[PDB]
Design an enzyme around this catalytic site. Structure first.
Site, mmCIF file in Angstrom:
data_model
loop_
_atom_site.group_PDB
_atom_site.id
_atom_site.type_symbol
_atom_site.label_atom_id
_atom_site.label_comp_id
_atom_site.label_asym_id
_atom_site.label_seq_id
_atom_site.Cartn_x
_atom_site.Cartn_y
_atom_site.Cartn_z
ATOM 1 N N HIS A 41 46.218 34.151 32.098
ATOM 2 C CA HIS A 41 47.622 33.891 32.366
ATOM 3 C C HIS A 41 47.813 33.010 33.589
ATOM 4 O O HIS A 41 48.952 32.808 34.044
ATOM 5 C CB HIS A 41 48.413 35.203 32.480
ATOM 6 C CG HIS A 41 48.124 36.018 33.701
ATOM 7 N ND1 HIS A 41 47.658 37.314 33.631
ATOM 8 C CD2 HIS A 41 48.263 35.741 35.020
ATOM 9 C CE1 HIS A 41 47.520 37.799 34.851
ATOM 10 N NE2 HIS A 41 47.878 36.864 35.714
ATOM 11 N N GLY A 143 49.924 37.441 43.671
ATOM 12 C CA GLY A 143 48.759 36.665 44.032
ATOM 13 C C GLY A 143 47.425 37.367 43.840
ATOM 14 O O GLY A 143 46.383 36.695 43.870
ATOM 15 N N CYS A 145 46.051 38.841 41.178
ATOM 16 C CA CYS A 145 45.387 38.821 39.881
ATOM 17 C C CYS A 145 44.042 38.115 40.013
ATOM 18 O O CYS A 145 43.887 37.207 40.826
ATOM 19 C CB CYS A 145 46.265 38.127 38.839
ATOM 20 S SG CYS A 145 47.882 38.938 38.579
#
Length: 305
Positions: A41, A143, A145
């Protein structure tokens, strides 16, 4: 002595964290050999996340649309492919700091250390367990991920988790390093609910053994029970049914303490039925289930890496 929630030393993983930017999205990637791993993603806008078609969004992306940064050094992306919910970015440079490593898919109840990162830079480290509903209770801000969870066996880092999502209830979901989500979760911003958060019975028992080793013995009673009798009480308190495999895993701790597993089980039954009466065990006012039997043996024998 003393007993503490303890992470693995994180230096070997720190030197694998990079920053990955695609368009206006930046998250963390894991650089091992000449491949950078990151959540797919990274290709999504905030609007895409409502309902992404990753295959289609990836068509609009080429090698140069992925900026990979290690420190103030730019890596060159020479190949990219989607594997389940992770992107693999092939880069022209092998990471010189690559440790010995493995990818592993963990079972519910197993624990691992999380290195929380932002913009490719490590922020802190803490312990987590894979719950039986396939969430973890982490600390993840925007931030974060692509932060990874891992275990260390002497020289081998076993990666088992990559962070992808925070559910509307504030728990956390993510994948193994092959991109397969733990549990039923998907990388889409939709209402997704977790199931029942059952307590990891075999972990509580190991922690009780750890307390006994460390001098907290007040909870020890004069009773014993049977697996079936104990499990009737466990079902009522949303505890995982105990199995003979679980009893076998607790054998080393039973031997060191001289306390049979079923005797510890009866003490646990009475704590569930009567409470702790405002007392503490190992400095906690509730039953802790995020220590494995392996974890307890390590911190009661001083295993190093």
């Amino acid at each position: 002595s003393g007993f503490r929630k303890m992470a693995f030393p994180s230096g070997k993983v720190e030197g694998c964290m990079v920053q990955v930017t695609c368009g206006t999205t930046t998250l963390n990637g894991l650089w091992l050999d000449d491949v950078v791993y990151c959540p797919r993603h990274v290709i999504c806008t905030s609007e895409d996340m409502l309902n992404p078609n990753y295959e289609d969004l990836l068509i609009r992306k080429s090698n140069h649309n992925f900026l990979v940064q290690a420190g103030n050094v730019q890596l060159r992306v020479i190949g990219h492919s989607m594997q389940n919910c992770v992107l693999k970015l092939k880069v022209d440079t092998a990471n010189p700091k690559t440790p010995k490593y493995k990818f592993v898919r963990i079972q519910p109840g197993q624990t691992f250390s999380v290195l929380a990162c932002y913009n490719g830079s490590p922020s802190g480290v803490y312990q987590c367990a894979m719950r039986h509903n396939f969430t973890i209770k982490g600390s993840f801000l925007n931030g974060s991920c692509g932060s990874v969870g891992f275990n260390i066996d002497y020289d081998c880092v076993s990666f088992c988790y990559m962070h992808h999502m925070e559910l509307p209830t504030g728990v956390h979901a993510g994948t193994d390093l092959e991109g397969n989500f733990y549990g039923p979760f998907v990388d889409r911003q939709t209402a997704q609910a977790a199931g029942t958060d059952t307590t990891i019975t075999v972990n509580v028992l190991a922690w009780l053994y750890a307390a006994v080793i460390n001098g907290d013995r007040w909870f020890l009673n004069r009773f014993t029970t049977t697996l079936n009798d104990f499990n009737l009480v466990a079902m009522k308190y949303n505890y995982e049914p105990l199995t003979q495999d679980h009893v076998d895993i607790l054998g080393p701790l039973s031997a060191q303490t001289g306390i049979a597993v079923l005797d510890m089980c009866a003490s646990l039954k009475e704590l569930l039925q009567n409470g702790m009466n405002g007392r503490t065990i190992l400095g906690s006012a509730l039953l802790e289930d995020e220590f494995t039997p392996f974890d307890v043996v390590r911190q009661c024998s001083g295993v190093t890496f």
